[PDB]
Protein backbone atom coordinates (compact mmCIF):
# COMPACT_ATOMS: atom_id res chain seq x y z
CA UNK A 1 0.00 0.00 0.00
CA UNK A 2 2.89 2.34 -0.79
CA UNK A 3 1.47 2.93 -4.27
CA UNK A 4 -1.34 4.54 -2.25
CA UNK A 5 0.97 7.10 -0.61
CA UNK A 6 2.72 8.04 -3.87
CA UNK A 7 -0.74 8.75 -5.34
CA UNK A 8 -2.37 11.08 -2.79
CA UNK A 9 -4.47 13.75 -4.52
CA UNK A 10 -3.41 17.10 -3.06
CA UNK A 11 -5.34 20.20 -4.16
CA UNK A 12 -3.40 23.46 -3.87
CA UNK A 13 -5.94 25.90 -2.43
CA UNK A 14 -3.44 28.75 -2.15
CA UNK A 15 0.22 28.86 -3.11
CA UNK A 16 2.10 26.52 -0.79
CA UNK A 17 -0.96 25.10 1.00
CA UNK A 18 -2.68 21.88 -0.08
CA UNK A 19 -5.74 19.88 0.94
CA UNK A 20 -6.47 16.17 0.59
CA UNK A 21 -9.36 13.85 1.46
CA UNK A 22 -7.90 10.34 1.24
CA UNK A 23 -9.43 7.18 2.69
CA UNK A 24 -7.08 5.35 5.05
CA UNK A 25 -6.53 4.63 8.73
CA UNK A 26 -3.71 6.58 10.34
CA UNK A 27 -2.48 3.31 11.86
CA UNK A 28 -1.99 1.81 8.39
CA UNK A 29 1.13 3.91 7.74
CA UNK A 30 2.13 5.86 10.89
CA UNK A 31 3.11 5.30 14.50
CA UNK A 32 1.34 7.58 16.97
CA UNK A 33 3.82 9.11 19.41
CA UNK A 34 1.42 10.46 22.01
CA UNK A 35 1.95 13.88 23.56
CA UNK A 36 0.66 15.38 26.82
CA UNK A 37 -2.62 17.23 26.56
CA UNK A 38 -1.06 20.20 28.35
CA UNK A 39 -1.91 22.85 25.75
CA UNK A 40 1.58 22.75 24.19
CA UNK A 41 0.99 19.50 22.31
CA UNK A 42 1.27 21.11 18.88
CA UNK A 43 4.84 22.07 19.72
CA UNK A 44 5.61 18.78 21.48
CA UNK A 45 4.66 16.96 18.27
CA UNK A 46 7.01 19.06 16.13
CA UNK A 47 9.88 18.64 18.60
CA UNK A 48 9.27 14.88 18.58
CA UNK A 49 9.89 14.78 14.82
CA UNK A 50 12.56 17.50 14.49
CA UNK A 51 14.67 17.63 17.69
CA UNK A 52 16.89 14.65 18.58
CA UNK A 53 16.84 13.68 22.26
CA UNK A 54 13.42 15.23 22.82
CA UNK A 55 12.41 16.12 26.37
CA UNK A 56 9.25 17.57 27.89
CA UNK A 57 10.86 21.02 27.48
CA UNK A 58 12.09 20.74 23.87
CA UNK A 59 8.85 22.38 22.69
CA UNK A 60 10.05 25.78 23.93
CA UNK A 61 12.49 25.74 21.01
CA UNK A 62 9.67 25.25 18.48
CA UNK A 63 7.75 28.12 20.07
CA UNK A 64 10.83 30.32 19.73
CA UNK A 65 11.20 29.35 16.07
CA UNK A 66 7.53 30.32 15.81
CA UNK A 67 8.48 33.73 17.21
CA UNK A 68 11.07 34.44 14.51
CA UNK A 69 8.82 32.74 11.97
CA UNK A 70 6.09 35.19 13.00
CA UNK A 71 8.36 38.23 12.66
CA UNK A 72 9.04 37.15 9.07
CA UNK A 73 5.62 35.93 7.93
CA UNK A 74 2.82 36.71 10.40
CA UNK A 75 1.61 39.88 8.67
CA UNK A 76 1.38 38.16 5.26
CA UNK A 77 -0.19 34.90 6.50
CA UNK A 78 -3.79 34.54 5.23
CA UNK A 79 -4.85 32.55 8.29
CA UNK A 80 -3.42 35.33 10.48
CA UNK A 81 -6.36 37.47 9.32
CA UNK A 82 -8.52 35.33 11.62
CA UNK A 83 -6.45 36.06 14.75
CA UNK A 84 -7.01 39.82 14.53
CA UNK A 85 -4.01 40.79 16.66
CA UNK A 86 -0.89 42.86 16.13
CA UNK A 87 2.43 41.05 15.85
CA UNK A 88 3.18 42.16 19.41
CA UNK A 89 -0.11 40.98 20.92
CA UNK A 90 0.06 37.71 18.98
CA UNK A 91 3.67 37.07 20.04
CA UNK A 92 2.79 37.58 23.71
CA UNK A 93 -0.17 35.20 23.59
CA UNK A 94 1.68 32.64 21.45
CA UNK A 95 4.69 32.56 23.79
CA UNK A 96 2.54 32.30 26.93
CA UNK A 97 2.50 29.02 28.83
CA UNK A 98 -0.02 26.38 27.74
CA UNK A 99 -1.23 28.48 24.80
CA UNK A 100 -2.13 26.05 22.04
CA UNK A 101 -0.80 26.04 18.49
CA UNK A 102 -2.73 25.82 15.24
CA UNK A 103 -2.47 25.65 11.46
CA UNK A 104 -1.30 29.28 11.45
CA UNK A 105 1.87 28.23 13.27
CA UNK A 106 2.31 25.18 11.03
CA UNK A 107 2.41 27.39 7.92
CA UNK A 108 4.92 29.84 9.37
CA UNK A 109 7.13 27.10 10.82
CA UNK A 110 7.14 25.25 7.49
CA UNK A 111 8.77 28.33 5.97
CA UNK A 112 11.08 29.07 8.91
CA UNK A 113 12.33 25.47 9.08
CA UNK A 114 12.36 24.72 5.35
CA UNK A 115 10.20 21.62 5.87
CA UNK A 116 6.80 20.33 4.80
CA UNK A 117 4.21 19.86 7.55
CA UNK A 118 1.01 17.83 7.15
CA UNK A 119 -1.79 17.92 9.74
CA UNK A 120 -3.99 14.85 9.40
CA UNK A 121 -7.40 15.38 11.01
CA UNK A 122 -9.36 12.40 12.33
CA UNK A 123 -12.74 11.96 14.02
CA UNK A 124 -12.37 9.67 17.04
CA UNK A 125 -11.74 6.41 15.15
CA UNK A 126 -8.38 7.72 13.79
CA UNK A 127 -10.00 7.46 10.35
CA UNK A 128 -8.57 10.38 8.39
CA UNK A 129 -11.13 12.99 7.39
CA UNK A 130 -8.71 15.30 5.58
CA UNK A 131 -5.13 16.52 5.35
CA UNK A 132 -3.69 20.03 5.18
CA UNK A 133 -0.14 20.29 3.83
CA UNK A 134 2.05 23.38 4.30
CA UNK A 135 4.95 23.18 1.87
CA UNK A 136 5.65 21.39 -1.39
CA UNK A 137 7.12 18.17 0.01
CA UNK A 138 5.36 14.81 0.08
CA UNK A 139 4.19 12.51 2.86
CA UNK A 140 7.52 10.68 3.25
CA UNK A 141 9.62 13.83 3.75
CA UNK A 142 7.16 15.86 5.82
CA UNK A 143 6.53 16.34 9.53
CA UNK A 144 3.23 14.48 9.88
CA UNK A 145 0.98 15.66 12.72
CA UNK A 146 -2.25 14.07 13.96
CA UNK A 147 -5.09 16.41 14.95
CA UNK A 148 -7.87 14.82 17.00
CA UNK A 149 -10.97 16.12 18.74
CA UNK A 150 -10.75 19.82 19.54
CA UNK A 151 -7.18 21.08 19.93
CA UNK A 152 -5.03 18.01 20.66
CA UNK A 153 -1.97 17.21 18.55
CA UNK A 154 0.16 14.07 18.40
CA UNK A 155 3.26 13.15 16.42
CA UNK A 156 3.25 10.64 13.56
CA UNK A 157 6.18 8.52 12.37
CA UNK A 158 5.84 6.88 8.97
CA UNK A 159 6.45 3.19 9.55
CA UNK A 160 9.75 1.57 8.49
CA UNK A 161 8.07 -0.43 5.70
CA UNK A 162 6.86 2.68 3.83
CA UNK B 1 -27.76 32.05 -7.54
CA UNK B 2 -26.30 28.83 -6.13
CA UNK B 3 -22.61 28.45 -5.28
CA UNK B 4 -20.79 25.31 -4.18
CA UNK B 5 -18.54 25.10 -1.11
CA UNK B 6 -16.30 22.04 -0.87
CA UNK B 7 -15.90 21.54 2.87
CA UNK B 8 -12.73 20.26 4.54
CA UNK B 9 -14.25 16.84 5.31
CA UNK B 10 -14.63 16.35 1.55
CA UNK B 11 -18.33 16.68 0.81
CA UNK B 12 -19.78 19.59 -1.16
CA UNK B 13 -22.67 21.79 0.00
CA UNK B 14 -24.89 24.34 -1.74
CA UNK B 15 -25.56 27.95 -0.74
CA UNK B 16 -28.14 30.42 -2.05
CA UNK B 17 -26.48 33.85 -2.25
CA UNK B 18 -26.51 37.05 -4.27
CA UNK B 19 -23.34 38.86 -5.41
CA UNK B 20 -24.19 41.55 -2.85
CA UNK B 21 -23.55 39.10 0.02
CA UNK B 22 -20.61 39.74 2.32
CA UNK B 23 -17.95 37.13 3.04
CA UNK B 24 -19.10 37.42 6.65
CA UNK B 25 -22.64 36.70 5.43
CA UNK B 26 -21.62 33.58 3.49
CA UNK B 27 -19.68 32.35 6.53
CA UNK B 28 -22.90 32.68 8.52
CA UNK B 29 -24.65 30.53 5.90
CA UNK B 30 -21.95 27.86 6.25
CA UNK B 31 -22.21 28.09 10.04
CA UNK B 32 -25.96 27.45 9.77
CA UNK B 33 -25.56 24.39 7.54
CA UNK B 34 -22.40 22.90 9.08
CA UNK B 35 -22.23 24.33 12.60
CA UNK B 36 -18.73 25.76 12.05
CA UNK B 37 -18.04 29.05 13.88
CA UNK B 38 -17.00 31.67 11.28
CA UNK B 39 -13.86 32.23 13.35
CA UNK B 40 -12.59 28.85 12.08
CA UNK B 41 -13.56 29.20 8.41
CA UNK B 42 -11.09 30.04 5.63
CA UNK B 43 -13.09 30.65 2.44
CA UNK B 44 -10.84 30.24 -0.60
CA UNK B 45 -11.50 30.99 -4.27
CA UNK B 46 -9.14 31.42 -7.23
CA UNK B 47 -6.08 30.74 -5.04
CA UNK B 48 -7.08 33.56 -2.68
CA UNK B 49 -8.40 33.42 0.88
CA UNK B 50 -11.41 35.73 0.81
CA UNK B 51 -11.60 38.66 3.21
CA UNK B 52 -14.48 39.55 5.50
CA UNK B 53 -15.29 43.12 4.51
CA UNK B 54 -15.52 42.35 0.80
CA UNK B 55 -18.39 40.70 -1.09
CA UNK B 56 -18.73 37.94 -3.66
CA UNK B 57 -18.93 40.51 -6.48
CA UNK B 58 -15.59 41.96 -5.38
CA UNK B 59 -14.24 38.50 -6.30
CA UNK B 60 -16.43 37.75 -9.35
CA UNK B 61 -17.89 34.55 -7.90
CA UNK B 62 -20.56 33.68 -10.47
CA UNK B 63 -23.28 31.06 -10.97
CA UNK B 64 -22.23 27.63 -9.68
CA UNK B 65 -18.71 28.62 -8.64
CA UNK B 66 -16.72 26.13 -6.56
CA UNK B 67 -15.32 27.56 -3.32
CA UNK B 68 -13.04 25.86 -0.80
CA UNK B 69 -13.60 25.82 2.96
CA UNK B 70 -10.36 25.15 4.86
CA UNK B 71 -10.64 25.01 8.64
CA UNK B 72 -8.35 26.68 11.15
CA UNK B 73 -7.24 23.67 13.21
CA UNK B 74 -6.03 24.10 16.78
CA UNK B 75 -7.34 26.59 19.32
Tally the helices of chain A: 4
**How many distinct domains of chain B?**
1
Hey, roughly how much beta strand do the residues of chain B contain?
25-35%
Instruction: Round the Cα radius of gyration of chain B to an integer and report it.
Output: 11 Å
How far is it from the N-terminal to the C-terminal residue of chain B, by CA? 34 Å
Most extensive contact = A-B, 28 and 19 residues
- Distance, first to last CA of chain A: 8 Å
Subunit structure (chain A): Interacts (via N-terminus) with host ISG15 (via C-terminus); the deISGylase activity of the viral protein interferes with antiviral signaling pathways mediated by NF-kappaB and IRF signalings. Interacts with host ubiquitin.
Active site (chain A): 41, 152, 154
Family (chain A): Belongs to the Bunyavirales RNA polymerase family.
Protein name (chain A): RNA-directed RNA polymerase L
Summarize the structure.
Chain A: Belongs to the Bunyavirales RNA polymerase family. The complex is a heterodimer of chains A (162) and B (75). With 162 residues, chain A is an alpha+beta fold.
How does this model look, in words?
- The PDB classes it as hydrolase, transferase.
- The entry lists the keywords Ovarian Tumor Domain protease, deubiquitinase, ubiquitin variant, hydrolase, transferase.
- The complex is a heterodimer of chains A (162) and B (75).
- Chain A is 28% helix and 23% strand.
- With 162 residues, chain A is α+β, with helices and mostly antiparallel strands.
- Chain A has a single domain (1-162), classed as Cathepsin B, Chain A (Alpha-Beta Complex), CATH 3.90.70.80.
- A seven-stranded mixed beta sheet of chain A has the order 1-2-5-4-6-7-3.
- The longest helix of chain A is centred in the middle third of the chain and has 15 residues, at 59-73.
- Chain B has 75 residues and is α+β, with helices and mostly antiparallel strands.
- Chain B has one domain.
- Chain B has one helix at 23-34; strands at 2-6, 12-16, 41-45, 48-49, 66-71.
- Chain B has a five-stranded mixed beta sheet with strand order 2-1-5-3-4, with helices on one face.
- The radius of gyration of chain B is 11 Å and the shape is globular.
- The N and C termini of chain B lie far apart (34 Å).
- The relative contact order of chain B is 0.30.
- At the A-B interface, strand 1, helix 4 and strand 5 of A face strand 4 and strand 5 of B.
Amino acid sequence: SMDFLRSLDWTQVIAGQYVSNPRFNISDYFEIVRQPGDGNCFYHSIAELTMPNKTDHSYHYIKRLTESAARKYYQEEPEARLVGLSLEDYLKRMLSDNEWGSTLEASMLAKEMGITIIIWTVAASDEVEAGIKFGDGDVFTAVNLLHSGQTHFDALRILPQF
Amino acid sequence: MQIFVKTLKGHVITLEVEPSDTIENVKAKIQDKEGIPPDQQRLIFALQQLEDGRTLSDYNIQKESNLHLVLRLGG
